[PDB]
Amino acid sequence: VSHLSPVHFYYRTDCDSSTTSLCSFPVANVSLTKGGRDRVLMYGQPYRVTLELELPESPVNQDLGMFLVTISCYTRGGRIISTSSRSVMLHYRSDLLQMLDTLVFSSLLLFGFAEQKQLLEVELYADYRENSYVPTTGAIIEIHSKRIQLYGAYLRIHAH
Amino acid sequence: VSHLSPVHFYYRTDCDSSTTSLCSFPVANVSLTKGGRDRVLMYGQPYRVTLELELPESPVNQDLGMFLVTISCYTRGGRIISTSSRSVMLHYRSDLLQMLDTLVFSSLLLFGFAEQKQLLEVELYADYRENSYVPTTGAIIEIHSKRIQLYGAYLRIHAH
Amino acid sequence: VSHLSPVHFYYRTDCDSSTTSLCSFPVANVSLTKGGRDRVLMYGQPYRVTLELELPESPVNQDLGMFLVTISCYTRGGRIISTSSRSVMLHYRSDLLQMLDTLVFSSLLLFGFAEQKQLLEVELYADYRENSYVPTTGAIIEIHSKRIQLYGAYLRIHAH
Amino acid sequence: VSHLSPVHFYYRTDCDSSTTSLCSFPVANVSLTKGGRDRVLMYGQPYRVTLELELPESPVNQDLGMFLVTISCYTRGGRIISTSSRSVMLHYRSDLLQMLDTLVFSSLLLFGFAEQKQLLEVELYADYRENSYVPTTGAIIEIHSKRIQLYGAYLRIHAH
Amino acid sequence: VSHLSPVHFYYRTDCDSSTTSLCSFPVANVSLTKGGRDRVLMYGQPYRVTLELELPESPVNQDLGMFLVTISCYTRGGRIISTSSRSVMLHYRSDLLQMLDTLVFSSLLLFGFAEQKQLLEVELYADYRENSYVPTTGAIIEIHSKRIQLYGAYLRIHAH
Amino acid sequence: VSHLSPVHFYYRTDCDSSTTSLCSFPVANVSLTKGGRDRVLMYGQPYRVTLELELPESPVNQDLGMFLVTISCYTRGGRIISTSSRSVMLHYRSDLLQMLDTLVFSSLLLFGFAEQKQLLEVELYADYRENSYVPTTGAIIEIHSKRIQLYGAYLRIHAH
Amino acid sequence: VSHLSPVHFYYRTDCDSSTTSLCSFPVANVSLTKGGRDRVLMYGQPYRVTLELELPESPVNQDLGMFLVTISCYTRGGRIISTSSRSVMLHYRSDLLQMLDTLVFSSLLLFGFAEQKQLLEVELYADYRENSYVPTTGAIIEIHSKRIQLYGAYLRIHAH
Amino acid sequence: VSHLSPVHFYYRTDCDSSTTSLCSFPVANVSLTKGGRDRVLMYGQPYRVTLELELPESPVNQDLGMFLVTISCYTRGGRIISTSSRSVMLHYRSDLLQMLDTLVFSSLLLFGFAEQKQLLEVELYADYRENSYVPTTGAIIEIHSKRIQLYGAYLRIHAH
Amino acid sequence: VSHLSPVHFYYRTDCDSSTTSLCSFPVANVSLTKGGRDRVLMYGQPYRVTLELELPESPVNQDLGMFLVTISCYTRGGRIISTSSRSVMLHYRSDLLQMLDTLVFSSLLLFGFAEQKQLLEVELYADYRENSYVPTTGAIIEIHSKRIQLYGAYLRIHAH
Amino acid sequence: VSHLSPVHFYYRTDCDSSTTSLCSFPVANVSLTKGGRDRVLMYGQPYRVTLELELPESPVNQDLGMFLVTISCYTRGGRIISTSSRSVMLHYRSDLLQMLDTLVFSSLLLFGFAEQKQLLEVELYADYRENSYVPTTGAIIEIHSKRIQLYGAYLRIHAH
Amino acid sequence: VSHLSPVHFYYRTDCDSSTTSLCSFPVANVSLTKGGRDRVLMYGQPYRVTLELELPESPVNQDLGMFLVTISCYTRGGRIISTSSRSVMLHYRSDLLQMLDTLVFSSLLLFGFAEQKQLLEVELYADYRENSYVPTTGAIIEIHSKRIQLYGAYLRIHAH
Ligand SMILES: *[C@@H]1O[C@H](CO)[C@@H](O[C@@H]2O[C@H](CO)[C@@H](O)[C@H](O)[C@H]2NC(C)=O)[C@H](O)[C@H]1NC(C)=O
Ligand SMILES: *[C@@H]1O[C@H](CO)[C@@H](O[C@@H]2O[C@H](CO)[C@@H](O)[C@H](O)[C@H]2NC(C)=O)[C@H](O)[C@H]1NC(C)=O
């Protein structure tokens, strides 16, 4: 099986008034290993995490070329065990094809069904292991772009 | 059951004349635990608060990418017991689809029925508890964007 | 029953020539408790005041995002007894829907019937009381925006 | 009955060449209590003055948001007895409705009948009295906007 | 009966080259009490002078909002006996109505009949008297706007 | 009878290169009292001079609002006997009416007949006399605008 | 009879590179009294010279408002006997009439016949005499505008 | 046979907020010679590596003219054995042909099939050898353009 | 008879890079009196030289208003015998007539026949003589405009 | 026979971020005389090398007027034996003809066949010889333009 | 007979990055008198060289007004024997005629036949001789414009 867990971002906005950009890089503590012993296995069949990220097709969202989502797993304390990084790219469409998309699919979009989202999927620990039997408590995921608009984020951990 | 309570914002505007933006971050004391003992339970079935927020599709409102709504529960005095934060995103639509929306639904919008609102819903204490039996008097909710246009706000506290 | 009373604004304009904005915040002494003893009751059924405010759909009027209307009740002298504040928002419409509004309703608007007004209503003492039996003489209502265009204002005090 | 009296404005224009604006605030001595004893009564049925003001729909006239017309009644010498103030607003119309107005009513406007005026009416001593039996000689009415275009002005004093 | 008399303006233009404006305020000595004793009567039926002024609808002429025409009557020497002042306003029309005016009335305007003039009429001594039996020789009429285009001017003195 | 006489202007152009304007005010000595005794009479029936001036409808010519044509009659030497001044105005037409004028009258204008001139006529010694029997030799006529385009000028002296 | 003589202009262009304008005023020695005694008569029937000048309707040529062509007759040496001056004006046409001119007359202009010239004619010694019997050798004609485009020039001397 | 291996880029973004460009050159450690002895052969049939690179037709992506992808093979430690370099060019199309491409292929692109990618292929060790029998552990591939948008990258090693 | 001779221009271009203009005035030694005694006659029937100049209707070529072509005949050494000067003007056409010219004559211009040239002809020694019997070797012709585009030039010497 | 050999360019890009241009001139070592004795002959039938260069019709590529491709043959060491240079020009087309090209050939271009390339061919050793019997190892070819977009390059050496 | 010989230009481009212009004047050594005695004759029938130059109709090519191609023949060493110079002009066409040219001839231009070239021909030694019997080795031809786009150049030497 494979249980997900929601990701909730935050960022400070201590600084002054901007135009549209944020003030810092959006980080997120995700949490895992809840009160029951149902977590990443001791030496299980190896894991394939994917950060199922969500994006709308804003014009602003469209401009940003690439942004790398990193990760770091912590164990007990401020104790990193493994890091990674994956660049990712918002999946491009032309302008004429967006006009034909919002004109052909005008029957679905005007009634709630399958709204204009473009949900990504970026795997970043293909064949993950948990060595030396120190338990992985959670992760600190972090995207490095001050100008990004995203609804929410899921984190699939998955077996094989 | 689940009773709501209205949220009334305020902000200072002590400063000089702006273009369209506000002068500070819109905060709000909500109030709870009224004269009858009908409040957040002692150790009840756990709570799921949602801040049902209201937004119109202004152009100005549309530009702002993300804004994080925070919360802080106070007990007796200036005594925080729990905080949180959720980023949230105004739900995007394209311009051609807005033209088709205000052209197809021209029979409903010109007669009061289901006007151009885009009411959000952002849960921020999924499975809330009230530990150590100090009573929660109310909350101080606060959105961190000086440029935001919103009608009103409800605060569902809800059981399971 | 429920008697209203008209509100007449004023503001100084001592300063130099502006473009369109005013010179100070529009305040207004409303007056109550006239020569007969027909005023806010001693311990009556509690009151629900609404400041029925009037606005035209100017472009200028449309730009302003939010503005908070405050209130302060005075008793005898410069003696405040209760204050409040409510932010309020001019009720948004798109531009294409305004073109369809002034095109579909061209039979009513060209003959005086139901002209292009957008009268607000903002309650600000839902369940008002008059405690310690000091009489409320009137109110000082005040909107905090130097750039606002409004015809007039009524003040419903209402029973239950 | 109710007799009116015409109002004739003046203002100095001592200053240099402007673009379109005036040089000072348009004041006007109106005059009353003529050679026969037909004036504001001693203790009559109380009065309701209205300053029936006249305005054309210039673009320039349209921009100005609000302007407060004041008043001051003088008795014998430079002796004020009563003052007031009323803000007033030029009654708004959209641009598309002005095009439909000057297109639908093209049969009346091209032959003199009911030309493009927008005559206001602003009451400013609803239930006026004349106390202590010092006679009111006239009034000094005054509008506080250097940029205003108006044909003429009548001053209804009216009984009940 | 009522005899008129033509008014001939002048102004200095001593100053340097302007764009379109004049150099000073257009004044005019009108003259009266010619070689026969046919002038303003000793104690006649009282007079109502009107300065029938002439204006074309030039764009430059159209911009100017208000201008006050004054007057001063002289007796024998530089001896004023009476002054006045009346603001006056060029009678407004919209642009679409000017297009319909020069399109509908294309049969009259292209053959000399009733050309595009907009002759004003501004009364400024309604019920004029000539007291103390010092004879009024003439008048010095004067309009206070450096940017005005006008053909000519008549001065009706009229009986009752 | 009434004999005319042509007027020939001149002006210096000593100064540097301009855009379109002239360098000084266009003056003109006209001449009269030729070798035969046929001139302004001794005490004749009084005269009415008109300076029949000629103007084309150039855009540059059209902008100029008013210009005053003066006059001065000289007798023997540099000896003025009488002066005057008349403001005058180029007779206005709109742009749409000029398009209809050059479109409707396209049969006359393309073959020489009645070309696009706008000849003025400005009387400036209505009931002229020649007192003290010093003979009037001629006149010095002069228009005060550095930016004016005119073909020629006739000077009617006329009897009654 | 009446013999003409061609006029050939020249001007220095010593100065630096301009945009379109010339460098000095175009002067021209014309020459007369050739090897046979056929010149301006001793006391002949008086002469009427006209400088038949030639102009194309270039836009640059069209802008220039007025320009005065002068003249000076020389006798033997640098010895002026008579001068004059005539202002002259390029004969105006509108733009719509130029479009109709080059559209209606498209059959003549595309085959050489009567090309787009606008030849002037300006008389400048109407009733010329040759007094004191000093012979007039020729003339120095001169137009005072640095920005003028002209093909050629004839000089009619003519009898009566 | 021929096994591929995925390439994952990274780059620092330590620097401040840019417009669209990156902060450094995108490098990538690829890895090879896994836990089984299936790697580049000792003296095998020689190899032909191709870096199958992926690009979308973004306007930003389209501007960049050429960019050289380099390579360096490392053995054991920071020990380069072989380098290369190949310039490469995004395969050009005109704008009218892109409009015809997204109009003709509108049936395939609106349903997921064969989306607007332009996957390159650039061979850079045509006839590769592994001399002196020091094993090649992996490669450090690197493209030298700070402004490039690319999804992913495969690295074919291939036999003959 | 009348023999021509080709003219070959030159000019230095020593100076730096310009936009379109040349660097000096285009001069040309033409040559005459070849090895046979066939040149300008001793006292022949007098000559009429014309410099048949060639011009294309380039926009740049079209702007230049006038340019004077001079001449100087040399005899033996640097020995001028006669000079002249003629201003000349490129023969004007309007823009609408150029569109009708290149549209009506589209059958001739697209096949080589009578291409868009505008060959001038400017006579500059009408009735030329060769006095004192010093032989004229050739001429130095010279046009004074740094911005001129011309193909070639012929020089007709012609008898009568 | 005639064997070709591929050319692989490189250039440094050490410098900072440009707009579109490169950082240095694109040079290339080509290599020849491989492990078998099949190279440029001792005294063979003479050679005709052509550098078959490849170019796309970018707008950017189109602007560059001329660029000279040079060459230098090296023998053993840094030892040049022969150099050359040929300017070359991208083969021009108009814009309307490019629109007709990508519209008429829309059946071939949308399916891979004969894509929008413009492959040049520039011979630069027509009748090449290899004198003094020092062997030519290869060549260093080099194009001198920092702003050029090219896919690849072949180098035909060819016999006769 | 008449043999030609190809001309190969070169120019330095040592200087920095330009926009489109070159860095120096394009010179070219042409070469003649090859290994067989077939060159310019001793005293042959005289020669007529033409430099058949090649030009495309770029917009850039079109702007340049005139450019002079020079020549210099060298004999043995740096020893000039004869020089010349001819200005030349790119043969003008209008823009509307270029649109009709690339529209009418769309059948020839889209298939390779007679592409958009405008090959010049400029003779520069009409009746060339080779005096004093020093042999002419070749020529150094040179065009003086830094902004010129040309494919190639032939040099006809021709007999009579
Ligand atoms: C993000 O990670 C965790 C989970 O939210 C938190 O870190 C805590 O750090 C202390 C440090 O001594 C340790 O007890 C644990 O690592 C965490 N606490 C608990 C109770 O698990 C914190 O929210 C964030 N940490 C950082 C470093 O940002
Ligand atoms: C928002 O929260 C409450 C409710 O409106 C108010 O805070 C009061 O703070 C005093 C401090 O001693 C305490 O008595 C209670 O916490 C509150 N008073 C009552 C009567 O409950 C106040 O309006 C706001 N407080 C802050 C800190 O902003």
Ligand SMILES: *[C@@H]1O[C@H](CO)[C@@H](O[C@@H]2O[C@H](CO)[C@@H](O)[C@H](O)[C@H]2NC(C)=O)[C@H](O)[C@H]1NC(C)=O
């Ligand atoms: C607005 O409120 C009242 C009503 O118009 C006025 O205030 C007066 O203040 C004096 C101060 O001593 C007191 O007698 C009463 O409070 C008011 N007077 C009366 C007769 O009721 C005044 O107009 C305004 N006051 C302020 C403070 O702005």
Ligand SMILES: *[C@@H]1O[C@H](CO)[C@@H](O[C@@H]2O[C@H](CO)[C@@H](O)[C@H](O)[C@H]2NC(C)=O)[C@H](O)[C@H]1NC(C)=O
């Ligand atoms: C406006 O009001 C009146 C009426 O026009 C005038 O004021 C006069 O002031 C003197 C001062 O002593 C008094 O006699 C009366 O108040 C007025 N005169 C008469 C004859 O009634 C004057 O025109 C204006 N006054 C001011 C102050 O502006």
Ligand SMILES: *[C@@H]1O[C@H](CO)[C@@H](O[C@@H]2O[C@H](CO)[C@@H](O)[C@H](O)[C@H]2NC(C)=O)[C@H](O)[C@H]1NC(C)=O
């Ligand atoms: C314009 O007026 C006259 C006519 O052209 C000229 O003035 C002359 O002035 C002298 C001065 O003594 C007098 O003899 C006459 O007034 C005029 N001369 C003759 C012969 O009549 C002159 O052209 C101009 N005068 C001025 C002052 O501008």
Ligand SMILES: *[C@@H]1O[C@H](CO)[C@@H](O[C@@H]2O[C@H](CO)[C@@H](O)[C@H](O)[C@H]2NC(C)=O)[C@H](O)[C@H]1NC(C)=O
């Ligand atoms: C223009 O006028 C004449 C004719 O072209 C020339 O002037 C000569 O001036 C000398 C001066 O002593 C006199 O002999 C004659 O007036 C003229 N010469 C002859 C032979 O007639 C000259 O070309 C020009 N003069 C000026 C002053 O510009």
Ligand SMILES: *[C@@H]1O[C@H](CO)[C@@H](O[C@@H]2O[C@H](CO)[C@@H](O)[C@H](O)[C@H]2NC(C)=O)[C@H](O)[C@H]1NC(C)=O
């Ligand atoms: C990229 O290459 C390798 C593989 O990711 C890593 O380099 C390591 O460098 C150390 C240096 O002593 C050596 O042990 C090996 O070369 C590599 N380590 C292992 C375990 O193989 C590193 O990630 C990157 N190296 C550089 C220089 O960027």
Ligand SMILES: *[C@@H]1O[C@H](CO)[C@@H](O[C@@H]2O[C@H](CO)[C@@H](O)[C@H](O)[C@H]2NC(C)=O)[C@H](O)[C@H]1NC(C)=O
């Ligand atoms: C233009 O004119 C001639 C012909 O091309 C040349 O001038 C030579 O000048 C010398 C000076 O002593 C004289 O022998 C002759 O006038 C000319 N030479 C011959 C052989 O005729 C020269 O090309 C040019 N001259 C100038 C002054 O520009």
Ligand SMILES: *[C@@H]1O[C@H](CO)[C@@H](O[C@@H]2O[C@H](CO)[C@@H](O)[C@H](O)[C@H]2NC(C)=O)[C@H](O)[C@H]1NC(C)=O
């Ligand atoms: C380009 O040319 C060659 C071939 O790639 C290389 O030059 C080497 O230079 C050394 C110098 O002593 C000599 O051994 C040979 O000329 C070349 N080496 C071999 C093994 O042939 C080098 O790549 C480049 N050279 C230059 C000068 O850029």
Ligand SMILES: *[C@@H]1O[C@H](CO)[C@@H](O[C@@H]2O[C@H](CO)[C@@H](O)[C@H](O)[C@H]2NC(C)=O)[C@H](O)[C@H]1NC(C)=O
């Ligand atoms: C252009 O002309 C020739 C041919 O290409 C070359 O000039 C050489 O100059 C030397 C100088 O002593 C002489 O031997 C000959 O004039 C030429 N050499 C040979 C072998 O003929 C050179 O290429 C160029 N010369 C100049 C001056 O640019």
